Design goal:
This protein is an alpha+beta fold and about 100 residues long. The protein contains three helices and two strands. It has a two-stranded antiparallel sheet with strand order 1-2. The radius of gyration is 13 Å and the shape is globular. The protein binds one RNA strand of 103 nucleotides through loops.
Length: about 100
RNA sequence: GGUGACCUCCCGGGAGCGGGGGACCACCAGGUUGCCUAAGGAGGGGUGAACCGGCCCAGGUCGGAAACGGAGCAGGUCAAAACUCCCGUGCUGAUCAGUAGUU
């Protein structure tokens, strides 16, 4: 239950910083989905679980392609980093951003 | 000096979110002014909706165990998106009396 949250808004290049986004547009992507996010995180060997029915507070678009939240574990609950490659939320996001595009395209 | 946006960094957080460094843009107030006008007030208003302003936001809604918060509707509201009318100012058609002043 002590896992960092991650909304797809954080990575969406068609959203302003005030609309949620957490990473520079240059590194961001178009319309990332919680599904896409979970898949690229898990596939690197991260412990991730997907909450299909959480919405972003700042998200306004009531249709399914923008719903969803991805929870990720960084820590084994002895305080140590599950992985050394992923110390921070930002380190997660930037990676997901880097990996999502190799899927569909 | 102010407002609103937008971009890019840190920092704290399980969320909504919290702390802080830069960059840029728009507008505002009112303090000096000009290689400035034919004349250019630092006026007065109104719209600000079907989503585009900003603010306050019932409900609802998203996040939350909750506190509370986000986004924001109906309604209210504006020194400060944008739009627009009026006043002033400048040129510029025109009207009336057959009015004069003087023939």
């Amino acid at each position: 239950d002590r896992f960092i949250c991650i909304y797809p808004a954080y990575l969406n290049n068609k959203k302003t910083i005030a609309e949620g986004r957490r990473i520079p547009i240059s590194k961001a992507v178009e319309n990332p989905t919680a599904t896409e996010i979970q898949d690229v995180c898990s596939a690197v060997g991260l412990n991730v679980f997907l909450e299909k029915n959480k919405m972003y507070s700042r998200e306004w678009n009531r249709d399914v392609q923008y719903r969803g939240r991805v929870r990720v574990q960084l820590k084994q609950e002895d305080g140590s980093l599950c992985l050394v490659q992923f110390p921070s939320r930002k380190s997660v996001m930037l990676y997901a951003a880097e990996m999502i595009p190799k899927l569909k395209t």
